[PDB]
Design a protein around this nucleic acid. Structure first.
Length: 251
RNA sequence: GGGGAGGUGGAGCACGAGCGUACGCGUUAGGACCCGAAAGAUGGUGAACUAUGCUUGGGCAGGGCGAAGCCAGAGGAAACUCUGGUGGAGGUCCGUAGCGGUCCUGACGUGCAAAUCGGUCGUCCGACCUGGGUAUAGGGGCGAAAGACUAAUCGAACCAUCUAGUAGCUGGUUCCCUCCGAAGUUUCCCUCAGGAUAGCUGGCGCUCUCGCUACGCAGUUUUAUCCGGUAAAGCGAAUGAUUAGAGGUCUUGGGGCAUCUCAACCUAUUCUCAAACUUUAAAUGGGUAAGAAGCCCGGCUCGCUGGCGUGGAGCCGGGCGUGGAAUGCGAGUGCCUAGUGGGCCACUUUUGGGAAGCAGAACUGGCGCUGCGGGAUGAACCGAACGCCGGGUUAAAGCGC
RNA sequence: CGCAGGUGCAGAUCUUGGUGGUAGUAGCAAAUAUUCAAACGAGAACUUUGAAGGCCGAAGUGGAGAAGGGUUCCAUGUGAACAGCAGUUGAACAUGGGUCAGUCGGUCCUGAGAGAUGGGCGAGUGCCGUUCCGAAGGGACGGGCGAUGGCCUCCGUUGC
RNA sequence: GGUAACGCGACCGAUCCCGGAGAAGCCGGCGGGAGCCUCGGGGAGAGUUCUCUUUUCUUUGUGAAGGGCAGGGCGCCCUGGAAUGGGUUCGCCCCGAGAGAGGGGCCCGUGCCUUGGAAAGCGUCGCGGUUCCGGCGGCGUCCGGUGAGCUCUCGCUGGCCCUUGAAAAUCCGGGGGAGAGGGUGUAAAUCUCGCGCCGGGCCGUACCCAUAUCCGCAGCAGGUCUCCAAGGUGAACAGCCUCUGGCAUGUUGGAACAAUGUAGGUAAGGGAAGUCGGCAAGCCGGAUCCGUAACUUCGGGAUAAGGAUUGGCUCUAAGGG
RNA sequence: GCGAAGGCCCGCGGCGGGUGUUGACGCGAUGUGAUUUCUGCCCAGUGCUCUGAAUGUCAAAGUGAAGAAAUUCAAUGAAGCGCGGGUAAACGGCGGGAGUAACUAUGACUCUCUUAAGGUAGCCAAAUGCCUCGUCAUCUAAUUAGUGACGCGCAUGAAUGGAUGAACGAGAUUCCCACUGUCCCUACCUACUAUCCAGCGAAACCACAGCCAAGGGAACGGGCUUGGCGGAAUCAGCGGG
RNA sequence: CCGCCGGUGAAAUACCACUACUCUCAUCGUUUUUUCACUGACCCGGUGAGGCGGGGGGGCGAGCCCGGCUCUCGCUUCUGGCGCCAAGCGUCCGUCCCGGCGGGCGGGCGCGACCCGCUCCGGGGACAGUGCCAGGUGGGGAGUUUGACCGGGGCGGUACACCUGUCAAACGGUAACGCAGGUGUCCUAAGGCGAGCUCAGGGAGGACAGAAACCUCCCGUGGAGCAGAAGGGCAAAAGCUCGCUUGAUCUUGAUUUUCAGGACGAAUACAGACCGUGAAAGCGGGGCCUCACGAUCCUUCUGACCUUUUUGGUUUUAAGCAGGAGAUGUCAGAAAAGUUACCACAGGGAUAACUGGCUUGUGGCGGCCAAGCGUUCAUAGCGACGUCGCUUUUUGAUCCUUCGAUGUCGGCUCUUCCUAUCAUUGUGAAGCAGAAUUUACCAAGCGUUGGAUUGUUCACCCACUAAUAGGGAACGUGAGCUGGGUUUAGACCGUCGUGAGACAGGUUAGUUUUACCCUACUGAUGAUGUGUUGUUGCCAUGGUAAUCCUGCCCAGUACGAGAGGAACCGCAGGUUCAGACAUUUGGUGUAUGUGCUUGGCUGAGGAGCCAAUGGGGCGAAGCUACCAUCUGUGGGAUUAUG
């Protein structure tokens, strides 16, 4: 047989991301002396739209503490921030929507977004529109903090991780039905070449394990093991269960 | 460590025949008699078509419907409703340019054209059409998915090489005359369109034999002597099959009523039968013998056998040619060996099948390999087989034209 | 007389070349259309001029460009071959000639992307990689410290 | 200099820092300007005149770059304080965060006049030399009106997007004030102001751009990216006829008018009886006025279905600046 | 499925690449296919997936023992299988056999077998029904066609999606009005051919060739046998050979 | 007294030392493991590697003790401003000036801006990761395979290795997917020997006892048994019952069967050993005889005072020699699943799917006999039980022709032929009164229709009709059409399959090429001859054509009880076909004839033109329609019959 559609994606030729009109990597500022000990004041200059990304981005201008120059950062816009607002980054920053604070100084129940997975990153978790993480508890002896992620999972991170107070702007985007093949087309024209999805049962057996037959049927169980080769791992990969759920399933 | 006797296994010995060289034929390994695959592999070249993503440009009359928002009026008691305008939404409708390609299964169909032409058709603000520039390259790409497209090539492109790839399969295989002359059958084989094997053929010889100025043999008969269970015949003979009367009677029999008839059994007869039945039993078959390798005398050897001068076998001398049926004929023997290993027809016999110019056997002859006279014509029938000719005569068949 | 062959063809839908019958046959039928007179000329249905009749009917059968072509452009001459009839004609053949820029483009900039060095990988030609594992500046206001040249009291050029 | 918006011909200044321009989608609706078309007159030339037509046809300029003035736009300024709310657009929309009213400021100015400029170009009437003199000369190149008209362009203002519609060279403005200049000369540093002097090298440039210069073996009914775009009819870049321009019927002609064919028509009376099947053809068709069902996701179905009218000529009424 | 020392994937190779200028309202992998109304039962089988291990099997390496060593033996012995779990909008599957309600025919309520459940709601001679042109009705004069019904349905059936349904369709089908050369049944007209001429000028194909009947023959002859017969050179058509 | 002597302690015990199955405690013992911490290898992230860890010093405070002691903190949180390139101090210079110090001019350094400490900061970390080996999983990928025979292949069978009877034609041999059957074993005896008996069945008797219990006599040629199927063989046997045994053992050759006169299997006579049995002669090296089985290579066991183990020697190991065993059943012995409708190549008429040819079971159509049917009566008309044929418009059977191709179902169109005759002409017979009908003869001249459904042939119905007969011609006819069906590639459903995919099931869409050659045929010129040429004519020979029905009258007549109900002559017409023809009606119409009319154009009128025939009305001539009209015929010899 020939290599299959999922295999062809990793080559990254026609399936690469469309990044011509994107505004840059949305991320926090690099940790420094001011954010480690006190705070630093920046100003929101514009709220801009990033193609392929539902969440709006905020352009925040800071002032360099070592030479005469103004810095420009691209943040994930917490819902509520506005142009002309002053945002504060540091361990002494107050608990306000839009500020960047270590999760250790945050109280329990605080809602955060653009959370660092490991200290010194620039925001890695809870970055999509309408998403947030919650601080559950701290452990000042080991300098660890538990956080609930938007998937429902629970994670122990370092308390020096930083985050933005609030939720990511643009929530409810999935509530409106797309309603149109064309609107789906325009949605993925800004992201990557993945949208019009042909079914494997509609293919020939040479391009998919589910192809062929005089009827349009899978012919073999669609639940596949984790160790299956690349051209075989199609269907439901390592499914712990199948069918309609009755309740909430979590680890 | 070396000897003996008696059996068996050896490509051995037993007064060498080989080596070198040339030629011919045969079997192979090699391109391997010549031409022929579908494939496989290794390195390369293509996205000037087309598929998809990206960058930068360009393009899309005129009409219909009339979403939201806004204005005014009428209400009603209010609720809120109704009316007339304005407005210009939409993967909205008609329909140009453009893009596409339904039906006529129209034209053309050695065309204008290796896919075009006409009328009629679908869409025509969108998932729209399009130029250039870019990216993805062959078990790879790309695919709103047809195994589609990837330079008229796609169920793995094209180029060169490995490569004169292999082929039990198809086609072809070049001068003359002379002589000899087949097989389609046996056994083994993933053997059934092929081989190996025996058989049939040819060539080279060789060992002898007869005769003039016989070593022996035979697709024949006869004379002796065995072998057989087919044709026939048989069932008052065995095993099976089977028809009808008759004469008797024990009846763990029945029926109609002291019973009496049936049935049963027995006995003697009677009709009809057998590839897998038989007492009997042909015709045509098959084997052996018809002398000198025989016959008859005398002696010797033996470890075998043994009452014995026994028996059996072997060996050494001697004698006997009326050459011990007919007919015909010169025999024996070695090496090498090609083609063939699809058969078919007829008298008789014969299996399956209603049968067949059907399928399968036996014997002999024939066609195939073969022409000639006759059957008008015809592979096989009847007659007869062939160097080039003259005379004569026939066969089978004929003699109205 | 001997020696040695790439030594004899009717076939192989054999190979190369040549030639027939078909056959003066099929055909020279897509988009309405030509006529009169004259000129040159050996020669005119087809060239040129004039006069008529028609067509494209501005999303043209018009006027200009991009690709691509490469002299096909222009003048003169020829009528051998070619332009599937002719031809006095041609995008044919021959002889000459023709493309002039500071202000129109290229040239410059980056885009999608392509691609070296450092580094890494790799038997290897090489490949991955484009900021990532680099001591990646060769410049400049200005100041100072010296040489040098000038319309040299002074200024400028050149090294640290 | 101006209360201000900003203005004037210049109006010093480095490292450094901030910003702007280059630099942004598609669709709709209005308005301004130009080109084209149109209408009424005046010139010059031409056509028709059998009868009429004071007619019909052609033609009737002012480049860039400066200067001035219209005109368009403005979330620019000053006075002032609005409800009995007012202003205003086709739509909207705007106002105590300052409406209306009045007065200013700026930007664009492709329009008009002007320098260029009539000396040139065109039209027409004549006179020369000789193949060419940009020969010479006379007269003219005028005055108006219209518009949802078409095209281009400049603006304003909206709609749509889970789509938000490049980057870099290059150029400019501002913040700061390290520095420089001269002591009162008729002076200095400095000047993005006016004029004057010198230079701008290399490559491309002819022509075809397609029913004959390109690809399809060819002068091949195929294919191949764009720009400009008159009159009439009419909704129209539809189809039909015409002007500017172009052409010679698409690699030949003459004669005839047979069959069969290809393409285009018509047909009495029936009206799908043909055929697998109404295939093919035919019916209907535009606009105006009426009238429109089942069903329905309430949007539609819908040009449902069905009916009437439609020419020419002569009038009337209404709709504006 | 995945919280990034990750999921999916590329690559001969480098903690090299794509998604990713990304972070669960995201990326990747599948199935079904608007809206409406529903989506029944089965985890035995095959997959996928979780850990309790009572824990059995279980290589290399390591450990110990015997022998002079090569060797041999023993214990130990990871994942996987086994073992117990989930799970069908995973692949799929959804039967009979009995026991029986006052004419029948039909026949709930009870129990059992394989290999777990026995086909629920709906729907149907359907694009799915062999028998079959099923039976009834309607459509016509006449209907193997159409439609509506019926239910033991060879072999319907519920995201291998069931049922339905406005709007839409160069999709398949039946009937009706209108209209007609589709037809009865053909005819006439027009242009371009074909035609003839001047000029130019191919190709396919070709053992030899070319009149029949019967015969026999490789069983359907142009040739052979026996009969019928046979007269130069050609033109336009034609489709038997 | 503790003590075997005492449950007559099953020995069980005082005295002693050992180990035996379990538990616990430990070991500076051995090894293997689990957890926590460290950093330094190794990894990840951030940054322009910009302030890390301690010690401070002063200031902001909080507490505590009577100035300390401990701790905190690092100067920025109303405004959509500004922020760098040091101020200020404290010192050191001038080759510089003006009065050692001062002033001016130009400079330097330190603090402002603390010191020290080894990794820039943070997060992991001896894990992850990498290299090498080992086990699992792995159609993601690669390579390959997927028997043969066969009245085509497949499905089915095994006729593939063996045995019995028959075929088989009286030696032997002899084929078919011929017939009837058996085999892949079974046996320590069912092998070997000896002895002694006689079996199946039947008759007659005997308590329970009977058709079958056991006892006795008699008859018994085997009619029983001998294990496997069948055939042969066998009676003081080879059968039954006992007794003893292992000749079913160890060896070398020869031979038979199949056969090539290789092998294997099986078998036959000997020979040399060692044994069994019996008194002995003898018999016995498996089964009474003909079936019951297996190469090389590899493995495994057994045998020898065996041979090699590579410089020699000893010992393990290994190799060899000989005989058994582990197996190939496709049985002379490869290691092996499917699909292809997306397909490919070499071939085959050695072989299927058409026609044709043989055959005719089946289909269809006839005939003979006569049991019955027909009120009566075998035969008007039929015809049982039987029996003989014909035909090739059914389907089979076969495989001769064609696989370097003979285009394939049906319909449409068109011609000709056959008769086994539906009608019509002429007849014969009847259970023929008339009418209607049935049976048969000559006979194929003429005719045999319009439609609904279906792709259909076939069928069925509706309706006319004289009748609505059956067939052939390569199952006539595709360079004649059509393409509905069947028969490619797209797609859907059901069932089957794990799947790829299959369906002799349904459904929908799906390119129909070439004639100009020869002949045939249709027409058209022409040809040889009569000296040339023309006119008028004759005829050989070939073709051939007419067909059927109404109404009136006969006549409400014959016939018949009635009901009903004809026919010949004659008259008037019509159907189908054929040959012509336009006077008339209709069609056509570009006479481009004459009006009308739209758009445009020639200045307008008049007159015209263009729009591939602009459109439309009416139209001459011509052509043409059962859509008008006209015409269509006589004898001869005879068939069946009388």
């Amino acid at each position: 047989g020939r290599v299959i559609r999922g295999q062809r994606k990793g080559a990254g030729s026609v399936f690469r991301a469309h990044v011509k009109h994107r505004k840059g990597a949305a991320r926090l500022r690099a940790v420094d002396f001011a954010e480690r000990h006190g705070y630093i004041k920046g100003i929101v200059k514009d709220i801009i739209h990033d193609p392929g990304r539902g969440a709006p981005l905020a352009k925040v201008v800071f002032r360099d503490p070592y030479r005469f120059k103004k810095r420009t950062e691209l943040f994930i816009a917490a819902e509520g921030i506005h142009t002309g607002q002053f945002v504060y980054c540091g361990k002494k920053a107050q608990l306000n929507i839009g500020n960047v604070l270590p999760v250790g100084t945050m109280p329990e129940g605080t809602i955060v977004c653009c959370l660092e997975e490991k200290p010194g990153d620039r925001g890695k978790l809870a970055r999509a529109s309408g998403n947030y993480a919650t601080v559950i508890s701290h452990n000042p002896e080991t300098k660890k903090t538990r956080v609930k992620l938007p998937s429902g999972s629970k994670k122990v991170i370092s308390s020096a991780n930083r985050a933005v107070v609030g939720v990511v702007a643009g929530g409810g985007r999935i509530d409106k039905p797309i309603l149109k093949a064309g609107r789906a087309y325009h949605k993925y024209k800004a992201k990557r070449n993945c949208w019009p999805r042909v079914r494997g049962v509609a293919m020939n057996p040479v391009e998919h394990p589910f192809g062929g037959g005089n009827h349009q049927h899978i012919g073999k169980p669609s639940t596949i093991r984790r160790d299956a080769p690349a051209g075989r791992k199609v269907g439901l990969i390592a499914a712990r269960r199948t069918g309609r759920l009755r309740g909430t399933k979590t680890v």
